[PDB]
Amino acid sequence: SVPVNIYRPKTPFLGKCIENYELVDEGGSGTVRHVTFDISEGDLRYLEGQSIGIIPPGEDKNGKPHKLRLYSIASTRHGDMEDNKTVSLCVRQLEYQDPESGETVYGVCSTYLCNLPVGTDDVKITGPVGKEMLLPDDEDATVVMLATGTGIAPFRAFLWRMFKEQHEDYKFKGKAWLIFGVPYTANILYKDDFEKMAAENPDNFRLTYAISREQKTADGGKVYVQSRVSEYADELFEMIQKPNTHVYMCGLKGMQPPIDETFTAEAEKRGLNWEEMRRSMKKEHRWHVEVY
Numbered sequence: 001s002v003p004v005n006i007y008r009p010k011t012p013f014l015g016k017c018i019e020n021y022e023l024v025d026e027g028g029s030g031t032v033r034h035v036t037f038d039i040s041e042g043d044l045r046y047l048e049g050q051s052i053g054i055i056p057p058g059e060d061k062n063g064k065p066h067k068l069r070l071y072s073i074a075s076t077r078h079g080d081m082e083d084n085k086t087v088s089l090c091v092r093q094l095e096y097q098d099p100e101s102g103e104t105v106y107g108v109c110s111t112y113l114c115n116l117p118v119g120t121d122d123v124k125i126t127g128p129v130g131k132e133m134l135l136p137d138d139e140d141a142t143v144v145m146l147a148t149g150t151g152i153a154p155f156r157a158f159l160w161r162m163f164k165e166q167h168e169d170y171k172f173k174g175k176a177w178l179i180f181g182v183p184y185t186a187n188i189l190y191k192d193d194f195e196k197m198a199a200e201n202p203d204n205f206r207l208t209y210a211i212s213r214e215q216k217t218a219d220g221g222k223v224y225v226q227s228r229v230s231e232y233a234d235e236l237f238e239m240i241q242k243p244n245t246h247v248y249m250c251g252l253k254g255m256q257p258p259i260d261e262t263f264t265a266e267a268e269k270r271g272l273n274w275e276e277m278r279r280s281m282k283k284e285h286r287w288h289v290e291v292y
């Protein structure tokens with residue numbers, strides 16, 4: 001029932017870019033783009049929380065095709081057009097500077113996607129992958145979603161499924177809480193969507209921001225997702241102690257250490273053992289991490 005590898009890296013589906021738009025508003029930092037593809041010519045089917053591979057064009061030193069890179073799917077199974085014909089991604093352009101030359105280097109695949117013109121054909125896409133970030137079957141589940149940057153992507157999908165679509169079988173009746181961390185208001189990816197869902201589902205959907213360059217801690221420091229987890233540690237632990245409660249974390253690897261440590265420290269403070277809680281959560285399949 002869970003699709004995987006409908007397309008293999010050997011023979012990827014060839015998609016067409018039908019949209020590509022900037023998500024960071026003026027005054028924000030960096031470039032993150034929402035990139036959508038028509039897939040209606042193939043059998044690509046997918047579930048919310050899964051990922052697809054992209055093979056950027058060209059070759060490596062040995063005349064060899066590049067490795068695929070994985071991108072979390074930002075759309076529901078039906079796609080943003082709600083016609084089952086498309087798939088979308090949330091792509092951040094990777095940049096760094098060489099420590100010896102000083103030269104700026106741009107990630108190969110993220111650059112390819114960010115500069116991908118609308119109309120472009122021949123996009124090499126590989127079949128859906130992942131089971132760790134799926135939405136629970138329990139329609140009454142409490143879903144806690146921790147996100148930094150492009151980590152918002154599967155949660156956009158979740159939320160659209162939860163509050164923006166009507167299904168013939170499913171209907172979410174639980175609580176959903178998104179804690180999303182970004183440096184500036186301009187950098188709130190999909191701000192208008194989320195805020196609209198919040199205004200329309202005021203008792204089932206809670207939207208908490210952590211805006212690092214605009215909001216201050218009591219010590220005067222920058223507010224990060226981990227700062228919110230600390231501020232609301234009591235509430236999170238109360239929630240975690242319900243069996244219907246799932247915690248999801250997505251974004252760059254660097255969000256994990258400090259989040260895992262806040263939980264740990266806030267657990268000790270309360271004579272609880274966070275390794276324990278996490279173990280059991282993992283055994284109950286209620287704790288999900290996709291960090292990259």
Ligand SMILES: Cc1cc2nc3c(=O)[nH]c(=O)nc-3n(C[C@H](O)[C@H](O)[C@H](O)COP(=O)(O)OP(=O)(O)OC[C@H]3O[C@@H](n4cnc5c(N)ncnc54)[C@H](O)[C@@H]3O)c2cc1C
Pocket residue numbers: 051069070071072073090091092093094095096097106107108109110111150151153290291292
């Ligand atoms: C399951 C999963 C989901 C993902 N979802 C998303 C997503 O939704 N959005 C998204 O944007 N990305 C996502 N990624 C990341 C994505 O797969 C790529 O790794 C990313 O886009 C960078 O690839 P690139 O081809 O542009 O960079 P590359 O050309 O691959 O360059 C990256 C590499 O260069 C080196 N490098 C990187 N940073 C530095 C640095 N700071 N200093 C020196 N060397 C460095 C490292 O070897 C690094 O691996 C996801 C990854 C996984 C595995």
